[PDB]
Design a protein around this nucleic acid. Structure first.
Ligand code: PAR
Ligand code: PCY
Ligand code: MG
Ligand code: MG
Ligand code: MG
Ligand code: MG
Ligand code: MG
Ligand code: MG
Ligand code: MG
Ligand code: MG
Ligand code: MG
Ligand code: MG
Ligand code: MG
Ligand code: MG
Ligand code: MG
Lengths: 70, 101, 88, 119
RNA sequence: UGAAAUGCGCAGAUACCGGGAGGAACGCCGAUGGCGAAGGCAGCCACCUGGUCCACCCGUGACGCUGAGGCGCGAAAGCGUGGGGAGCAAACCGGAUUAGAUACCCGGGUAGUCCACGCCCUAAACGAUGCGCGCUAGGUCUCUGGGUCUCCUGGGGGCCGAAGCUA
């Protein structure tokens, strides 16, 4: 569909507290989205996943969700 | 000293009595390990993505700090002895990598 | 680690003249520094075999430099190794 | 027995059987059925038709407790699955939501030989 | 499970919710990707630590390459001592299948798989390709530096291919 990167302005993707931003990079099942979807550079996507994994331990982001209407 | 970032998550059902007592048991430990405290933040209450310690929310501290590296694990050990202290995550500071200019 | 104040101090402390950053005497000096940090680290971390290779390379490269020196200037050789305490 | 007007339908599709269990909205089971509880035994419990009948049986037993609507929650892939769902929907019993909640390791325990195959 | 049976279940199993213990492994990210000399390395954090790339062209002044032997590393399985043991599982105990079935399938299950220390030193340890250096068209995709950032210039991973080589 349309890339998640393209729907945002600047943002520090080292920022493991900005759950508002971070959360659009997760799927409806709280799974880290692949680059095909996130629209990221390899290097960026590496840094992302790292800080997504931080948010998660902080309690700020989900490790999982359940799929609604299936 | 390296520059670090100390996230603490607290029990969301506290009152000035303990909350403020915790916050200084913290200051004592931070100080007692050599932690100068630059910036500090406190968004405080917030909705967790999954329950921590049976409870659906958490109270969020965040401290920027400079301090001696040979102790930073020791400090972290001390912080979580406490019971209303639920998550401690000490993290090296980092230049903000940004995206989309 | 080895911070550049620590390191600069070791370059001054040797260095034939002001500005000598390369050269046998300095190079051996720096290597001797790291070898010692890294010998210290493995005294505890017996299992850290990967690091231990690093050591072998450093050691050989140092031994290689000193071979060179002792051949060119047998004096400032005896001076260097005495000043650092080694290779006996 | 008690009157509960809505609660959960928990479908457990597996390649060997669908088992449908119905509960109050706190998760305590009211009734339950399976391919075995219907006539079937052995390989036939696996069928989608077995699924329909169990879904329907367990929905009937549940309307005996005056059940009106359910939150559906599916787990496992299995022949009977969308069939078990389609049953509930068309059973009188009203289906508020449907939710896949199939449990999955964040790779953890070694599988049995049969389920390693992806090795 | 092809179909079954052994097996577990009215000492109440299965499915469902709540609490607790433990062991082991880290899903998405994840790649045609990265790192390491090889073996090999994957949740997150901190400390300790090895390698390596680019820019400046500042320093030393051939200090280089290779390397019998030596020394060290060396997947799995295996061994010793002591822990640990959730799941999996040689052997083994059963159920099927079969003409038979010391197997393939199902149900159990010990060593082991896990940790520490000490052994073992093997492999389709494979790129089945010794290390180092110079030289000889390009095109295309990718990881990672620098620039005057359309394009240029390093380092690394692929694909097609000049000259040439090859049974
Ligand atoms: N995950 C921990 C790390 O693993 C390494 O080794 C340690 C651990 O992995 C290893 O296992 C620990 C053990 O500490 C402890 N006594 C029992 C505990 N169950 C184990 O836990 C750990 O290993 C197992 C392996 O799956 C799992 O629990 C989990 O992956 C991990 N938490 O034992 C080692 C020390 O007891 C490194 N030594 C170190 O970086 C750190 O302990
Ligand atoms: C597959 C089928 O129709 C059928 C019929 C008669 C006998 C059997 N026997 C089967 C028998 N259950 C067999 N298992 C098997 O095929 N599975 C798919 C579990 C077993 C290991 O001995 C087999 C391989 O021998 C078998 O396939 C026959 O070959 C299968
Ligand atoms: Mg069956
Ligand atoms: Mg439970
Ligand atoms: Mg390999
Ligand atoms: Mg020069
Ligand atoms: Mg000169
Ligand atoms: Mg070995
Ligand atoms: Mg082994
Ligand atoms: Mg043993
Ligand atoms: Mg048998
Ligand atoms: Mg078996
Ligand atoms: Mg078993
Ligand atoms: Mg090749
Ligand atoms: Mg190239």
């Amino acid at each position: 569909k349309a890339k998640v990167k393209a729907t945002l302005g600047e943002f520090d993707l080292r920022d493991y507290r900005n759950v508002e931003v971070l959360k659009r990079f997760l799927s409806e099942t709280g799974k880290i989205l692949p680059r095909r979807r996130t629209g990221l550079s390899a290097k960026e996507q590496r840094i992302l996943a790292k800080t997504i994994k931080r948010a998660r331990i902080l309690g700020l982001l989900p490790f999982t969700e359940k799929l609604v209407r299936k | 000293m390296r520059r670090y970032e100390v996230n603490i998550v607290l029990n969301p059902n506290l009152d000035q009595s303990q909350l403020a007592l915790e916050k200084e048991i913290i200051q004592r430990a931070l100080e007692n390990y050599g932690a100068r405290v630059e910036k500090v933040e406190e968004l405080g209450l917030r909705r967790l993505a999954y329950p921590i310690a049976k409870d659906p929310q958490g109270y969020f501290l965040w401290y920027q700090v400079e301090m001696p590296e040979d102790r930073v694990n020791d400090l972290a050990r001390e912080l979580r002895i406490r019971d209303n202290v639920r998550r401690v995550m000490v993290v090296k500071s980092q230049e903000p990598f940004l995206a989309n200019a | 680690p080895i911070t550049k104040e620590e390191k600069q101090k070791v370059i001054q402390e040797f260095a034939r003249f002001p500005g000598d950053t390369g050269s046998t005497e300095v190079q051996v000096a720096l290597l001797t520094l790291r070898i010692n940090r890294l010998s210290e680290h493995l005294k505890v971390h017996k299992k850290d075999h990967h690091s231990h290779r690093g050591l072998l390379m450093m050691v050989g490269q140092r031994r290689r430099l000193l071979r060179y020196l002792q051949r060119e200037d047998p004096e400032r050789y005896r001076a260097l190794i005495e000043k650092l305490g080694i290779r006996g | 027995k008690r009157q509960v007007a809505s609660g959960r339908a928990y479908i457990h599709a597996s390649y060997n059987n669908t088992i449908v269990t119905i509960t109050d909205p706190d998760g305590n089971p009211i009734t339950w059925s399976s391919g075995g509880v219907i006539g079937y035994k052995g390989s036939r419990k696996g069928t989608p038709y077995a699924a329909q009948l169990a879904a329907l049986d367990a929905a009937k037993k549940a309307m005996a407790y005056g059940m009106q609507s359910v939150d559906v929650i599916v787990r496992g892939t299995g022949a009977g699955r969308e069939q078990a769902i389609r049953a509930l929907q068309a059973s009188g019993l009203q289906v508020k939501s449907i939710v896949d909640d199939t449990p999955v390791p964040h790779n953890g325990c070694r599988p049995k030989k049969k389920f390693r195959k992806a090795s």
